[PDB]
Design a protein around this nucleic acid. Sequence first.
DNA 1: AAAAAAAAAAA
DNA 2: TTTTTTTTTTTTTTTTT
Lengths: 362, 362, 362, 362, 362
Amino acid sequence: KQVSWKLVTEYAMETKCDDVLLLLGMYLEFQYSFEMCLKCIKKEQPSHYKYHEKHYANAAIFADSKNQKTICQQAVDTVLAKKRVDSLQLTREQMLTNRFNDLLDRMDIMFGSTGSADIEEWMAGVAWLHCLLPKMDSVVYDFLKCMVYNIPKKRYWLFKGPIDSGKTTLAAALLELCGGKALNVNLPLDRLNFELGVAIDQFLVVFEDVKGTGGESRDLPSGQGINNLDNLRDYLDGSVKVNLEKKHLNKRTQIFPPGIVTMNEYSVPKTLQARFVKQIDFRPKDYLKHCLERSEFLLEKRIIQSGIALLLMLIWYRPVAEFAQSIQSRIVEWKERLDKEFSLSVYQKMKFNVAMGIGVLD
Amino acid sequence: KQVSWKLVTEYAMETKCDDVLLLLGMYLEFQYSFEMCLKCIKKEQPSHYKYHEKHYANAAIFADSKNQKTICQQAVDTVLAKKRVDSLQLTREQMLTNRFNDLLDRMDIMFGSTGSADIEEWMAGVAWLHCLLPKMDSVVYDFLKCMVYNIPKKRYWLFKGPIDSGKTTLAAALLELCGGKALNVNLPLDRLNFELGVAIDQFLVVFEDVKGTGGESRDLPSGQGINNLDNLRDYLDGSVKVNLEKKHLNKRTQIFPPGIVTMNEYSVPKTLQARFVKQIDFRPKDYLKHCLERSEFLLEKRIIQSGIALLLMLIWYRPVAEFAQSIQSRIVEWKERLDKEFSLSVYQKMKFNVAMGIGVLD
Amino acid sequence: KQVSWKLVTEYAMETKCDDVLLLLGMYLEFQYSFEMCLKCIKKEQPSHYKYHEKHYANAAIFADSKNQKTICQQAVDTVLAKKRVDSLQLTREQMLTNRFNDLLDRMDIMFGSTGSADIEEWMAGVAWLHCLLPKMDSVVYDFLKCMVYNIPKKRYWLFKGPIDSGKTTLAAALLELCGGKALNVNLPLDRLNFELGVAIDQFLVVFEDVKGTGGESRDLPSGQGINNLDNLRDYLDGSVKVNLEKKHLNKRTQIFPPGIVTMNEYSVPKTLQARFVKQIDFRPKDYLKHCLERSEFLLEKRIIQSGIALLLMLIWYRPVAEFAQSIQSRIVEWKERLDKEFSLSVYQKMKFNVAMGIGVLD
Amino acid sequence: KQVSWKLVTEYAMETKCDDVLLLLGMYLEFQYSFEMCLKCIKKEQPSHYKYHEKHYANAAIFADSKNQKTICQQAVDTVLAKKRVDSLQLTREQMLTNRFNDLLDRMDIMFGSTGSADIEEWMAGVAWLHCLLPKMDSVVYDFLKCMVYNIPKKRYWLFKGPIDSGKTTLAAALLELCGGKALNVNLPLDRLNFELGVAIDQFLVVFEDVKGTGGESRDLPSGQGINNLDNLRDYLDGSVKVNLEKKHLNKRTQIFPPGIVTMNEYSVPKTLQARFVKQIDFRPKDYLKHCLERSEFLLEKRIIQSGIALLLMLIWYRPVAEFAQSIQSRIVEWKERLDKEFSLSVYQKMKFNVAMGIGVLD
Amino acid sequence: KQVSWKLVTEYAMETKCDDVLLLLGMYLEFQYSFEMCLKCIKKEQPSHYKYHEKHYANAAIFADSKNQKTICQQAVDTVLAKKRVDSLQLTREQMLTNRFNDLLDRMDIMFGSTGSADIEEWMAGVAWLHCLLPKMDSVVYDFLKCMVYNIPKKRYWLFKGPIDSGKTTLAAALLELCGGKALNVNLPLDRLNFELGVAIDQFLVVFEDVKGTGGESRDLPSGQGINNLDNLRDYLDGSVKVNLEKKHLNKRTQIFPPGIVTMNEYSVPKTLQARFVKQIDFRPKDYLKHCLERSEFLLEKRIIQSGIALLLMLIWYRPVAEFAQSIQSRIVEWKERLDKEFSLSVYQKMKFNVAMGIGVLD
DNA sequence: AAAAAAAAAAA
DNA sequence: TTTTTTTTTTTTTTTTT
Ligand SMILES: Nc1ncnc2c1ncn2[C@@H]1O[C@H](COP(=O)(O)OP(=O)(O)OP(=O)(O)O)[C@@H](O)[C@H]1O
Ligand SMILES: Nc1ncnc2c1ncn2[C@@H]1O[C@H](COP(=O)(O)OP(=O)(O)OP(=O)(O)O)[C@@H](O)[C@H]1O
Ligand SMILES: Nc1ncnc2c1ncn2[C@@H]1O[C@H](COP(=O)(O)OP(=O)(O)OP(=O)(O)O)[C@@H](O)[C@H]1O
Ligand SMILES: Nc1ncnc2c1ncn2[C@@H]1O[C@H](COP(=O)(O)OP(=O)(O)OP(=O)(O)O)[C@@H](O)[C@H]1O
Ligand SMILES: Nc1ncnc2c1ncn2[C@@H]1O[C@H](COP(=O)(O)OP(=O)(O)OP(=O)(O)O)[C@@H](O)[C@H]1O
């Protein structure tokens, strides 16, 4: 009997693999009988233990086949095809709603009885993040609206300030929340073509620690980054479609994604300053440093850097009426859950600990 | 039964798909049964609900197939072949007529009973654009006729002015109205070969935001853009054919399109400036900014950069004797529809609102 | 009868061949008869004598085949697919535990009755290394813990001091222990992209002898390294996924590996110094030099740089509970072996010899 | 039945088509019944209406085939192969016989169709150039034959005069007649090699504005051009093959092209002056400068520079024996158009008005 | 019958062809009949006359085939696969042992009845070389041992002396004996990386004529070479692995080869002087110069540059037991042959003739 | 030289 | 047509700066 290419494509769709080697590796695990399969018995990874019993019969035939990489290539192109259809046909609010659904699915596993996480650690993260900026939850909500409306020349935000002020921490959390890529523009202009091509079909991009000039009077080293962004200011505008490039592929014509620029305090030419809607000045705070020294699990487990921490901040602080109607059902259920496992008394205690520089937990 | 490759080519020719991945994604949607299709009963996108009933029988067989990307590649090449036949065999006025017939079909769907658009916002769009330049509708009509004549050495218009002047918004509207591509020529000369290859078979080219050198006392950072256009001199003149390149596909020899060049107030070489037939100078106007702040629905729905807004300007201001003969009858239909919806007193009120800097629609 | 592609994939998986030409070369050795096989009689290389009996039948058929490279290519992709699945799905503890199992398998070959090595010469290396830094085994243990936890911005160590001070000796030993690669960031900036591409899917990276400007009055050469390294701030941090490239391959998005910087006495920017957790000052001290003049065998056999010397140092000095539970069984068998053919009275005499500056062995 | 690839190859050779997508598109037009065919009945394009009836049967079978691009690329290779067989065996007079047919096909755009500027002001262009130099039309034919014979040492012509001498206009006109390219030799010696390498595989060259040594006493800006060109004697004389370099490519060996040198009244060194066959002085004429002030369309429709006007001069004045046997019929077929449209008196009026310093009248 | 791919793979392995076109050319010569074959009768090339008789039948069928390049590709792959297995698994002693009996095969052909080499002239070369340095055969034997043992920091030699002293003569002879390649480190430091990439998988490298910077007052040109070697400390020392780069190929990691540095009477920094295990001083000698004038055949046949002359020197002067056991029997046969053709009185007469310049063979 | 996809052989 | 099998060519990288 022959291999069903359909069953492989169906597995790739359910798991969202866009890598041929990953898909080949995963599917070849299903050769062995599930009756004795140690990974299924341990329940270590969901993309194995859910699917092995369904795919065992087909994977045994697949391991005898001669054209295995061709089968996987067709499946990966099917996933990339759906991804491109969805980029052209969905509204940006639906794309964000789909992303929140994915995060909530991961939260159900992570805080379920098979999961590792304790919510007290994650909500201690919410408390630490809310101390970072005045009205943090309003800032996060204002950012989400800005990325959904995608208004020409009113698209990009600037994070500015000295070393260890939290720019990258908040930027990385917002990048996971929305889904997107970080780009390095400090490289010289010639190979910048293939860097920018990483942005194809992405929802956000972040430009990380762009270097300027003249900062040597403050002991900041010079570089090409700000000069390079001046050359790309039609990509920042978003009024008109730009041409984006991958090695050995022809150019994709699309409007470039919105997002965040992170900077140390170099001077910004007025031509770029005209592209930025809002500047957030980060400043370092002594009590936040003292707190992370006592509560190091926040850095080991990457809690303050996670999008799930910012999603929990939104679930806690925002009215239900600010979410899309499809997910309001799931978010009322998650508010009910958080209302059991916390009280305002525990959360206010956590905030008071952080302002004193004490450990978050007690 | 076997797959019909002809049916896939019919779907692709009816939909005008240039992308193999997009065509694959859309045709795979048809594998699910028509009797229950949620997108057919909600009528989300016409490229689905018009065609799914016809194609369900064939898409079931296509989903089992091993050749899927090869089938789509031949369908995409059939559509690209038609574009090359039409580009060489049609007159430029017939091409512009075909562009307007597609824009008007889009307007019929957009302002129909199924439509979402509100025409008062779009005619406020016309009013805002008419304030941007004196005798705007004559500037638009001169451009359209200039691009249809395409006389060698008199093919390019220069848009010049400071950091916020409206030059990009007007170029973007003309680009949708005429069709074309925007190109970035601030990058080094080496990789421009594949950038210029995007101009193959197009009607217009827009060279956006060409950086100059000197004028630095204005606080404009310098760059290679103007030096690159001092090269490429024969592409602008168009008195000769050029070779255009794209990856793996064989190169094509054609006369390069006409276009628009936008730049901030850099000093321009005389050898370049000799090749532009017209300069339009753009000035900041304080009242236009106050107007958009109070009427931001114009930016959210991208009305002031849409080609449809310039076509509605042309329908309103120009006589039917200035349009082509085949399109007369539907322009007569639209021009009566517009006089039925708007009293001239409403348009006069709108234009007075914009000059007064109050919100339009107030 | 026809060639089994399954047996070739099995041999490649057992041997871990990810080079197509090496696999082809190895497998074509099996076409000759097992009985007369001089390599099975001498027992030189284990990759031959363990497997020839099993694969003889299939290798004879493979030698008559017309598509030998197509067969080998699939096997090499199967091995790379396992490697990419393991990178995405294993914990860093498991990765390190697997690496220790591989080194212990090597040690069983080196010190078994077919092997060439003498345990007392390797153990002299441990004594010389334990004299290089104070509390050396705590330093090696702290490093492994740091590389496993991979805490953001707290994950690089700096080795700093004069020339001939032991930096690259120790760094090379740590590199073989953890597995990873050494990078030269002193290159010109446009070569630097492919130099950073060496790090893809590695556990550890080491930056060898980075040079700066200034300090030239100390007779230090000048160089670009520190300037380049300060463009790469976000690669060191590990907060976001960087985009890594190889020649002719599309960009891989992943978190950059942690590791070590080795440096002469330049000054360093605060932007970089904020990214190092620990600075270890290496000082030259002449008893170690006079020792190595007299105990030359340490240099000649490469014992002093090898990771197996550090692993032996961890087995001699650390409690058994500090190793992962799967490997504790082998480590107590090795502690028994070392206590049986080596003694504490010998070890303190070896260390006394090194401190006295005299040849280590009796 | 099955597709005849030979019939497709015959169509490609009869239409002389060397684009694979263009061939695919035009051949797919033949799949419809010729009894009904609107493009035939409208007689729009010869590449359709002649061939449809013959190719209809094959085109219907071709539309069902799965390998359509394979069929078309064999046919395009057949046309490219014929072109290379001819080109490698081409005499230099057959090269010019080909070059002027392309310019004639461009003039057949103003023949019998409104798609062009009015010829009456282009004959004023013929007249105005015939007033620039004594016996202008004989200068053109002597120059043409000089370039066709390629006689060593007898190959370069020198044009001298101040600003506003017309030398650049006639240099442009002669260049655009013949299809060479223009080179700049004012560069420092380090850069000349890539400038000279532009001349590869090319019919003519022009050297523009070679700035001399000294000349400030005539208010002429000094440069290296004359001094450089004196060093290029082996390129100018044309007896031996020079090696020429394009950027990134390997060298080619050929005999360097003939053509034109243009100068202000700098001093020409005797060693360089001996290499020019003929010096033509251009001198400013006040009556021409008044005429062109009174007849702006000469410059603003680019009549005087466009080298097509020099063929339009050769058309009328010159005998029939002065043209090759394969185009003698085609010129007299063209020439009777002007014999019907014009008279000696109106051309004498054109000349007279120019000589009087007024625009053409009556 | 049908082509045996196995017989072609044998021929490629026996000839060691890693070039597909060379193999294709060689194998197609075998289609013509053996009985009449002029190349076999004249015995011009051993790669033909040995094998033609065996392969005639397969070559006749191969000449009719359609797959000819694919058969040759697989055969070339088989040869390259063996080279990589041998590179990764052989001891350095087996590598040199294989290189010697490869040279003994060349010696057999040269000095056989079919050959063209006069052993009296080659033995005169051995005499002239033995007079170049004191204890020459021990110098050569010590060098071989040093390169085989590859002991870190005891693995580079320095050759120093005036121009025309014999340095590249001896260095070139040692390269042919061991195998290896020459390197030019006088390039600027940013062009050096592809030059160092020549060393990949080589047994030796020679640094040819490194120039110093000071000492110009002795008429010695200034250059970068020794300053570049000071920077490459870690490549020479050989304790740790380095990354090496070929054009278009990914970086490979290995311990850089041992070798020779050759220089004029430049000043050496003391840091570099400590990296050489030995320094050999070459001084011009008049009697060798006057001998070479009378014994010109040494230069004209390139005898004194060749590795075969050094191998004849080791065969003549060294005891049998210090060659590897596989080659001892072949060297005993060669010792018998040489003692048959030469007595000690003839050889000491040749040394006596050199020492006073009368001319070796008199 | 490797990757994307084409192009062909035998039942 | 189906399955198994064989083949092409270019871009990128280098070169250039
Ligand atoms: N506002 C803050 N005040 C004090 N310490 C902070 C603050 N934000 C972050 N930290 C600490 O500093 C570490 C680094 O933070 P982060 O990298 O986000 O800063 P950054 O301002 O973006 O830095 P850089 O300019 O180096 O990119 C965090 O892991 C945390 O321990
Ligand atoms: N004439 C104008 N006066 C004042 N504000 C203007 C004017 N035209 C446009 N604006 C404002 O400037 C914004 C940007 O307009 P636009 O993109 O056309 O500017 P531009 O001059 O082309 O810019 P750039 O020089 O950056 O390419 C608009 O969205 C609007 O808010
Ligand atoms: N602490 C030390 N004191 C004295 N000699 C030392 C010391 N450590 C190493 N050595 C000697 O110095 C030699 C070189 O050591 P090593 O390569 O580790 O130096 P390094 O300073 O780290 O080098 P680099 O900066 O060039 O990588 C060793 O082989 C040993 O002989
Ligand atoms: N004989 C003439 N007398 C006066 N004016 C002339 C004459 N011929 C041409 N002109 C006008 O003078 C202009 C400048 O001359 P032209 O274009 O030939 O450049 P040029 O004389 O080579 O000068 P430059 O060295 O400045 O480029 C022409 O374009 C035309 O308008
Ligand atoms: N010791 C010597 N004394 C005199 N003449 C010599 C001696 N060795 C070589 N010769 C002659 O000098 C020529 C040049 O020798 P060789 O190529 O070795 O020169 P080198 O100056 O030492 O090398 P390099 O140019 O690489 O530094 C030889 O071909 C030979 O004719």
